[PDB]
């Protein structure tokens, strides 16, 4: 069974930390029983619930950092985009669409026209 | 190009009471000391490896192609040659078998098949249906699994549905008069395919 992330995202940070320490206590109490019993698969659900809780906590923290750095240049290098090194070093579509006043005037004066040949 | 040569074999020469074929070096495997690089050797290089720059396609003179296609068309109007291909035209009244240009506008395989039954190709279709057999050799698992006879070749002037109506009927081929492939007209280099002409095609042939 385990915990569901959609009912954890409604919780606060402290509630989640208490949940996490309780789950770790349960995991220790289960590891002391695993050596007595022949088999104990209940431990898997507790492990995955710990993972879900930590994922939710990470998300909650990262979104707050995103909102702190919202709308300003120089945000951190784990909240930026990863796309690729070369695509990150590539010219933007602004810098690549820049032209001189000489070429702008010629593009405006003599653009490629739409012509057809029947008459 | 790499095959039989991804090893560093060198001959032991004479004095070791073995043959002078080059051998794998090192030790500890089983391949150590085995023959290598030879066509007589297990794991070696086949004699005269096959190349892609073999000649695959052949020039045939245009006029010889056309001579042969004309001959294969003329052989269609010979009941002795069509029977000798096994085309089941004994009850067919006479050939060249010409039907109306109404056949070019047929859209449905059912109607197309019924027209051929009425005209007389019923047995030449049943032959194909009965002749499906598994190919014998290793072509089966080379996407050549099923063999069968061919039935008639329907020749049209313009396509208004007939090729799609006859696309799924086994054995039946369709052709336009302009192209008229020799591979269809004389399959296996045997003359006398059963050809059903439309009147427009029979007229455009001139």
């Amino acid at each position: 069974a385990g915990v569901k992330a959609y009912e954890l995202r409604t919780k606060s940070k402290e509630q989640l930390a208490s949940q996490l320490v309780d789950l770790k206590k349960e995991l220790a109490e289960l590891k002391v029983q695993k050596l007595s019993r022949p088999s104990l698969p209940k431990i898997k659900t507790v492990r995955k619930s710990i993972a879900c809780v930590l994922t939710v906590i990470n998300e909650q923290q990262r979104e707050a950092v995103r909102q702190l750095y919202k709308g300003k240049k120089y945000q951190p290098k784990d909240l930026r985009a990863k796309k690729t090194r070369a695509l990150r070093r590539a010219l933007t579509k602004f810098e690549a669409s820049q032209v001189t006043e000489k070429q702008r005037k010629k593009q405006i004066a003599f653009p490629q026209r739409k012509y057809a040949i029947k008459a | 190009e790499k095959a039989g040569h991804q090893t560093s074999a060198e001959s032991w020469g004479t004095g070791r009471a073995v043959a002078r074929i080059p051998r794998v070096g090192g030790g500890g495997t089983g391949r150590s000391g085995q023959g290598a690089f030879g066509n007589m050797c297990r794991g070696g290089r086949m004699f005269a490896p096959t190349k892609t720059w073999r000649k695959w396609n052949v020039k045939v003179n245009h006029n010889e192609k056309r001579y042969a296609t004309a001959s294969a068309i003329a052989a269609t109007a010979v009941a002795s040659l069509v029977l000798a291909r096994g085309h089941r035209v004994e009850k067919i009244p006479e050939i060249p078998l010409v039907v109306s240009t109404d056949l070019e506008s047929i859209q449905k395989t059912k109607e197309a098949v019924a027209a051929l039954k009425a005209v007389g190709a019923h047995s030449d279709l049943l032959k194909v249906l009965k002749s499906k057999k598994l190919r014998a050799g290793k072509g089966k698992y080379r996407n050549r699994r099923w063999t069968q006879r061919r039935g008639p070749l329907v020749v049209y002037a313009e396509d208004n549905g007939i090729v799609k109506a006859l696309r799924n009927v086994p054995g039946v081929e369709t052709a336009n008069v302009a192209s008229l492939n020799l591979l269809q007209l004389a399959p296996g280099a045997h003359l006398g395919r059963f050809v059903i002409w439309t009147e427009a095609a029979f007229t455009k042939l001139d």
């Binding site: 070369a86 070093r89 590539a90 010219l91 933007t92 602004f94 810098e95 690549a96 820049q98 032209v99 001189t100 070429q103 | 720059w53 000649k55 695959w56 396609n57 052949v58 020039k59």
Partner: protein, 135 residues
């Protein structure tokens, strides 16, 4: 010149290749200057170079470089072609003025071997072209 880096002048071959001293390095001194400057500053792109002075031991060159990361060059359409990645280490491939000079890349009958690229023309006219229908 370029002394052949070979121990004690032994080349282990035929007399035509026994030369050690009189060899000349097909690339120019301007070129090997551009190389060293581009290795010292790999974040920049070499644009051109020019002689400024010389003596018996040394030749002195000034290399113009351009930072393709600076926004004054990222913008400024006249110079943002250097910021494309096909211009990384131009000097190392021979795309500068002296690089093309030394590659022999000019128009005309005097540059038939080196017009489109020497190795390209060699590979072209030492290639057997075979067609489906053999001509």
């Amino acid at each position: 010149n370029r002394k052949r880096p070979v121990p004690k002048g032994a080349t282990y071959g035929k007399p035509t290749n026994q030369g050690v001293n009189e060899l000349k390095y097909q690339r120019s001194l301007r070129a090997t200057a551009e190389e060293r400057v581009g290795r010292r500053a790999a974040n920049l792109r070499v644009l051109n170079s020019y002689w400024v002075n010389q003596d018996s031991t040394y030749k002195y060159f000034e290399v113009i470089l351009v930072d393709p990361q600076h926004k004054a060059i990222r913008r400024d359409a006249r110079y943002n072609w250097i910021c494309d990645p096909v211009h990384k280490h131009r000097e190392a491939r021979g795309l500068t003025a002296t690089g093309k000079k030394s590659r022999g890349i000019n128009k005309g009958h005097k540059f038939n071997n080196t017009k489109a690229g020497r190795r390209k023309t060699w590979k072209r006219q030492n290639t057997l072209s075979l067609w489906r229908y053999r001509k």
